[PDB]
Design a protein around this ligand. Structure first.
Ligand code: A1CEQ
Ligand code: A1CEQ
Lengths: 674, 674
């Protein structure tokens, strides 16, 4: 239990040691074990893998990722496969409840994210809290395991965590990088004829789509069917339907994969590629850091990604997907280059990834100081400097500035001992950034004075996150929708701050320059557009109808859905801790409605993990209005309902599931819930 | 199963035949059975009696009375002991759900209330619906039983109900009357010497307390202790404490009973009297129609009750309490008179009660027409006249006026067939009078545009009933409280319509004359005062603090509490049916908080019938925050918690309950709830 930090190339079973360590620790010490993954998709995949691997040893695995949380108390859990942000929140709650001793280990995957990133600083704060608590209160307290690619300063990380060091460059399928600069058709024919898959990485979504289209066209001109038809049918019966370009590309063993698709379409395509049904997959940079999707040959369109040379870490994790362990002998990663791009390509071929920074006046430092002070682990400046010493920044005088910032804004109170007042405790529990918590407090307080209960829009405006630009707003369509809005929605629009003058300015004149800090008035109108999108979402309108009405594709709609669900949960916890009972009561429902995009009636019916928003409606419209009512039903009835040996329905982390046993599992899990 | 209507003097076991019939029908047909009582106190007493009687025969008895409702679905019930209005609502819901065939019989007690009364018309419409649905679809489907005093037109009632007729004047303790030679002291001395109790009836509250005072003083000057001390201690530990006058009146076997007291104090006094602990009880007119409280000698202070001769029905039910069946030989009811009051006294001594009216443009007819049309039992004018014929008024052309009234106000839609739109269905389900439902709709709709969620005052203003004058508002104190009000409450005050000008007018100038219909603005300020009282009630402040702060006594506070609880439940059902999900969500909690006068935290902890608002807090402050937590606890722990072989705590329908075994039932019923 002396911690550990090791690195190794992916596609070499590098997580096996971690799984072994969690198994041994959980079985011996009978203590919990977090498993921090960077992204929600890989987190879900790991959660399902661990569930399958440990279901036979009486180990409960259920993670805190995305907008979801385990249906059972954390006490019952044995392994929690959470994400970075939600793992930080979990550790904050454990510290708050003075039950940190339940934790036995914190396994962190993809530790290289500690460096430059908007979520790495959360990992740094999490690990710093682990180290500080472990050292202040002691051999076998809390083990930390790390993972990453080749890290230039991996030994620095091990020293910071006071852990071992193991670095090895060994992969069963030795990769053969080769840059080369007619013959394209011959190359495609000879690559496909070898009975191996190909993974292309293109910079643009549109260019990925078009390149997949031309490859499918060339395969058609130069020209298993049953399994490909099965995949096509699976794609057909989805809420977003089937994409026409994807329709004409899929049945030729060619497809595309980008953030524009929906999570279900991406999952279907990834599964088809994994089984070999899809031979060529044109993905984007997002898939590079996504699920484990090995390919015999990887190809990179151009090092220019988004008007800039491709990142070295991104390129490394792209080439890491070249080679199948068990069935393939060697792997190839081609990077086509041009006369002008030859220098950039040669630069990318050589050189390892850059060293890991710390990303620590800065909001990260304000957050860390708030976490320690509110958690009751560093109340005096004498020891807070010790926490600073524990940070990765130290191991590689802003505290006084940050502590004043918290006293200036009434996050903490001085007495020289420091304490939180109400917003310090409510800000930490909600896992909201202290910078945005002031605006959230001001907006929620203003809402409770004049709330509009006519519709769901005023509640949506308060749970709409504007921390990132999910889509480029088409202001002409927004103005048309505005002039077509009801009076009930226009009341909330005027209440929040939306003005027809600004909309008119944007409709014809160019987007107003937000050169001044007082011009958060632009954020209000973007937030109202987003809240209208969310209202259409939770009103259970189809994704395509939203896309036509608003211009946001289905992938962006789903991303906004997840962001709004997480933000609604966070705001609900904030209101609960602040003692706003009516606001919390109104916001409590919206987290699940936004997670699934359903109506109030289906909220109870979606507690069954095996029930989409569309599958909840067809069962609800039939007459099953409750999970208990589901438990009392024959399998044949639900099967005929779903209809109105072929694997046609898709569910996350599925198996050889068709509509026959899908009905069987719906009732079986309904019984389990009761 | 041919219905029945019988009459007999009270104290003659008139309910024995009804109990026999309900037992027979429930055991044979295995169908439900309603037991309609006029008042909540007598309804509770009858519910407990039926529970004790039929627990051993596997018959579940649970009543819909007051602000309470059974914790189990009506399907599981075997007998429902409901009140007139809640039985009417129950039958309306059964008609709406097309399950009136579930009933087996409807036993009605105190049928004479059908005449002049504000609640008899509900009984009339209830029985009219029963007999109409019986005749339309077959006459042995739902047996009806009746009870009353000597009705001059009992045969007419039986003919209306097409039922049998039995009228007997039999009482084992015959009542005597003879004038024989302030001549009250010797009367009291000789009545108390022979070891008998006395029940005095007085026309007011203050004079009742004063007469109790003088009687106790005389007994003290002219002179079981353990049981009286037990009663005194029971009165001691109550939320309202012990009355400064009752404290010195009780030890001498003398007490008083009026609406000013709390329900618990009235229950304690009644129980003490029934056991013989209290030898003299000065009650008021309310006790006349209350629980069964026999007394050897009844006395009536004066026929003038509230500036008018005592009612004949009221006098008959007063003298009905003269004579104990089983221990007494004869009973007497003295009516002291004066030279001027001799004529009124002799007039009231002779003569039976007046004939029963029907109390049917009138709001009762609008309600009946709405009930039949919305229930789907009379949708065409051809049959609605059949319903009119089925009424008691017919058996002893306004429909067209009422039907237009409902169409004018959009309660129903004509097509010639009639249907409800949304307010017709929402008005019937909520059991709200259609006359007040328009104001309720207008007020709720206005609230959902500018709701104030800072506090509970805006929710309270919408669940505050102003159907009766519960107290005389002291406007100087109200203006002072207004001056000291926070800004958050003043915001809702201005939103609802409260004005400083009107309060200033009332503070100094005489009460403004509401001679015009547009002066419902006076009702707004009374409603706001009542809503402030309710806010302090649900904030869990003591009754005495509210009385000092507002001037309303504890009895009036409790009456307003029950009225507001019932109205909150009704408004919640109204909002649910109208599709106002946020309003319903906000109003859902408040019914229980008003029923018990507790905070949000104790709502789950009061699900145990053996937990007051003070006992919920005492257990809650200790650490029991849930019924499940209460179940998992040793009896001795809860016993010591309550303490911080003597019966000192009081619960409704109690037995020889001591604190030692009181904690035993708290955990026992806590387990039963789970
Ligand atoms: C209160 O916080 C949440 C509530 N609810 C949800 C859920 F409903 F979605 C998610 C969160 C959450 C969101 C982010 C975030 C984030 C962004 O990156 C994206 C969205 O916008 C802001 C930035 C980070 C952390 C949390 C969080 O606290 N998680 C936890 N839940 N239980 C816990 C426990 C426990 C006891 C065992 C000890 S810890
Ligand atoms: C929806 O109506 C209520 C809701 N909730 C409460 C409770 F919470 F208090 C009480 C009522 C209620 C109040 C009055 C009244 C009255 C006033 O005299 C006093 C207050 O102000 C207006 C006049 C009259 C009737 C009802 C009522 O419908 N009862 C029922 N409940 N379940 C039922 C069923 C069923 C299925 C088996 C078939 S039927």
């Amino acid at each position: 239990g002396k911690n550990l930090v090791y690195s190794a190339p992916t596609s070499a079973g590098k997580t096996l040691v971690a799984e072994l360590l969690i198994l041994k620790r959980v079985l011996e010490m009978r203590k919990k074990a977090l498993f921090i993954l960077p992204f929600v998709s890989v987190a879900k995949e790991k959660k399902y893998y661990l569930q399958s691997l440990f279901q036979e040893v009486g180990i409960k695995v259920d993670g805190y990722m995305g907008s979801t949380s385990p249906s059972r108390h954390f006490s019952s859990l044995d392994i929690a496969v959470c994400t970075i942000e939600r793992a930080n929140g979990l550790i904050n709650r454990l510290i708050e409840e003075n039950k940190m001793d339940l934790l036995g280990m914190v396994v962190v995957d993809e530790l290289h994210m500690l460096g430059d990133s908007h979520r790495g600083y959360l990992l740094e704060l999490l690990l710093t809290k682990i180290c500080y608590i472990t050292r202040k209160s002691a051999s076998n307290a809390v083990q930390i395991v790390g993972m990453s690619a080749t890290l230039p300063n991996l030994e620095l990380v091990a020293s910071w965590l006071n852990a071992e060091l193991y670095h090895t460059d060994f992969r069963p399928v030795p990769l053969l990088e080769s840059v080369k600069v007619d013959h394209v058709v011959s190359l495609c024919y000879e690559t496909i004829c070898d009975n191996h898959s190909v993974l292309l990485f293109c910079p643009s979504k549109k260019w990925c789509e078009k390149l997949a289209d031309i490859i499918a066209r060339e395969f058609y001109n130069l020209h298993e069917q049953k399994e490909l038809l099965e995949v096509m049918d699976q794609l057909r019966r989805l809420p977003s339907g089937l994409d026409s370009v994807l329709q004409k590309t899929v049945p030729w063993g060619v497809a595309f994969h980008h953030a524009g698709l929906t999570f279900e379409e991406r999952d279907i395509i990834e599964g088809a590629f994994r089984q070999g049904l899809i031979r060529v997959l044109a993905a984007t940079s997002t898939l590079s850091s996504g699920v484990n999707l090995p390919a015999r040959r990887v190809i990179i369109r151009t090092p220019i990604f988004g008007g800039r040379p491709l990142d070295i870490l991104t390129y490394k994790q792209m080439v890491g997907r070249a080679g199948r362990k068990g069935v393939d002998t060697v792997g190839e990663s081609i990077l086509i280059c041009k006369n002008s791009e030859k220098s950039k390509g040669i630069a990318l071929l050589q050189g390892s990834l850059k060293p890991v920074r710390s990303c620590l006046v800065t909001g990260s430092m304000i957050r860390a100081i708030l976490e320690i002070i509110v958690g009751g682990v560093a109340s005096t400046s004498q020891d807070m400097h010790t926490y600073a010493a524990c940070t990765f920044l130290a191991a590689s005088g802003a505290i006084e500035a940050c502590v004043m910032w918290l006293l200036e804004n009434e996050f903490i109170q001085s007495t020289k001992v420091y304490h939180p007042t109400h917003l310090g405790s409510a800000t930490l529990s909600s896992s909201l950034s202290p910078a945005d918590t002031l605006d959230i407090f001001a907006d929620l307080q203003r809402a409770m004075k004049g709330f509009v209960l006519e519709n769901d829009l005023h509640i949506l405006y308060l749970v709409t996150p504007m921390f990132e630009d999910w889509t480029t707003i088409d202001w002409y369509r927004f103005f048309c929708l505005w002039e077509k809005l009801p009076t009930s929605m226009k009341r909330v629009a005027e209440l929040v701050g939306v003005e027809e003058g600004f909309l008119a300015r944007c409709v014809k004149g160019k987007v107003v320059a937000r050169t001044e800090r007082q011009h958060r008035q632009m954020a209000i109108h973007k937030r109202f557009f987003t809240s209208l999108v969310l209202l259409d979402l939770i009103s259970e309108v189809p994704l395509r109808e939203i896309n036509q009405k608003y211009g946001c594709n289905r992938g962006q709609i789903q991303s906004l859905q997840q962001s709004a669900a997480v933000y609604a949960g966070m705001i609900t916890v904030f209101s609960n801790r602040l003692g706003w009972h009516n606001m919390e009561l109104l916001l409590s429902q919206f987290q699940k409605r936004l997670t699934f995009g359903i109506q109030r009636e289906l909220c109870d019916l979606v507690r069954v993990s095996l029930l989409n928003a569309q599958r909840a409606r067809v069962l609800y419209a039939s007459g099953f209005h409750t999970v208990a009512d589901l438990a009392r039903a024959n399998i044949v009835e639900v099967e005929v309902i779903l209809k109105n040996n072929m694997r046609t329905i898709w569910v996350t982390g599925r198996k050889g599931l068709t509509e026959r046993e899908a009905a069987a599992l719906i009732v079986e899990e309904a019984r389990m819930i009761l």
